[PDB]
């Protein structure tokens, strides 16, 4: 379930973005704990909210700069902490999040004295897509959650379960994977600070 | 919404008890923080679950004491781990939970130095319900949630809001609130013995 590829203008179609990341919330299942759960409830929670302002009119909101043009004008003041717009600026959060980590555990990012474990590449991912957005107690939160994350071994072997494929094969789907994934991470940044759609309040 | 009085075979209606415990998630809102919501969402989780099966048959699920029974005859191996079964075997702890907890609270119970928080009146009340059913990760994940709970003094504000009574006269309200409340929930703790249908897995 790749990305498309950008085109030159860089517009992002909403119907297969949401298609595509539909697919994302359900690899939460490879990680093997309750903890997780919550998660993948708020990631699917975006989505969700993005696809029925969608649905009202696909025309309207045909791309992610649709969404955004279309809600400022349509919402008072309240914009951007509103509709899909909102949901839009969690959500790539969590798609940054993914991309880091995933990232980081393909270019061999490790602790050396656990190289098994992958909570250095969580933590890196946390620190550049969420952390920031969280207070002291929700960070706290995260802390104690990374415990519960899987060995590196059986997180790769159950992204790429039946397959019957290398590790090695295994990583080199996932860089694949992230070619056009960062692409349209970094081209949706881009658009919330050009549309000045971007807020910073903590939770 | 308060409870109905036990009836002197204590059996609990399924209908009745189902509409009294679904007003007790919006409650959570008076905590203050999102740091809660997954905690309603699980709570209401169970209900919406419970109601579901009740909804296939209301006669048949005329009481929990039917769920049990009906359940148990109707799965196999896998009762008492399953259905609404499970779900009432969940919410009868954060209902347990919320009687410990007010009930600490309405019994002056304090921390000397800290006496307008709560959190000794929730780790007492966490401790008795759920503590033994966590794994040391979520355990350390309550720990840390309990910082975002609010002042006493405006968490009994917010039970009130409105009504523009005292505290003691609140506090007198639960008081009330806590008679059936505790006595139901007793009797569903004794079923669950009873039907062998308790489980002590951790999560
Ligand atoms: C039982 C004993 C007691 C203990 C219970 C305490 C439990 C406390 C748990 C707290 C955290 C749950 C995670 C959810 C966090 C969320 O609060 C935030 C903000 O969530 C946003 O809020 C907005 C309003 O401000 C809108 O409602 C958004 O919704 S809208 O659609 O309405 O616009 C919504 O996403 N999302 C986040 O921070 C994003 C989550 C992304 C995570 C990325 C993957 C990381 C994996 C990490 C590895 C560990
Ligand atoms: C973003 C950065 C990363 C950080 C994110 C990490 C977030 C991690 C949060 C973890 C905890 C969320 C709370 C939910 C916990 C639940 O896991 C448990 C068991 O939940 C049960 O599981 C069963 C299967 O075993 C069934 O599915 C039940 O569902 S069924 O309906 O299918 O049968 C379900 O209730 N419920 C619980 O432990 C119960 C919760 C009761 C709470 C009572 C009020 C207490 C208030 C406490 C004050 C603080
Ligand atoms: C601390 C664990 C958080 C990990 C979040 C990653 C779960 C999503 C996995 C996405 C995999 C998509 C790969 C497709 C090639
Ligand atoms: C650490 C905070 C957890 C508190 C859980 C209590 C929330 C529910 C309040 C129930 C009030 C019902 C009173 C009716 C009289
Ligand atoms: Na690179
Ligand atoms: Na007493």
Redesign the interface.
Same mark, same amino acid.
């Given at each position: 379930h790749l990305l498309k590829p950008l085109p030159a203008d860089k517009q992002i179609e909403t119907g297969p973005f949401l298609e595509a990341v539909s697919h994302l919330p359900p690899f939460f299942d490879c990680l093997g704990? #309750?903890?997780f759960? #919550?998660i993948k409830?708020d990631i699917s929670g975006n989505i969700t909210k993005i696809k029925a302002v969608y649905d009202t009119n696909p025309a309207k909101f045909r791309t992610l700069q649709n969404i955004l043009e279309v809600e400022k004008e349509m919402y008072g003041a309240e914009w951007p902490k509103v509709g899909a717009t909102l949901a839009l600026m969690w959500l790539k959060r969590g798609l940054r999040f993914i991309q880091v980590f995933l990232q980081s555990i393909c270019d061999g990012e490790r602790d050396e004295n656990h190289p098994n474990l992958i909570r250095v590449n969580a933590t890196k991912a946390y620190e550049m897509a969420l952390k920031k957005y969280h207070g002291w107690? +929700?960070q706290?939160?995260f802390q !104690?959650?990374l415990? !519960?994350a899987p060995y590196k071994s059986d997180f790769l072997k159950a992204l790429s379960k039946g397959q019957n494929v290398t590790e090695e094969e295994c990583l080199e789907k996932i860089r694949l994977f992230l070619v056009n994934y960062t692409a349209t991470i970094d081209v949706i940044y881009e658009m919330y600070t050009q549309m000045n759609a971007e807020l910073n309040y903590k +939770?």
């Open positions: 704990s #309750p903890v759960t #919550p409830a107690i +929700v706290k939160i !104690a959650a415990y !519960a +939770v």
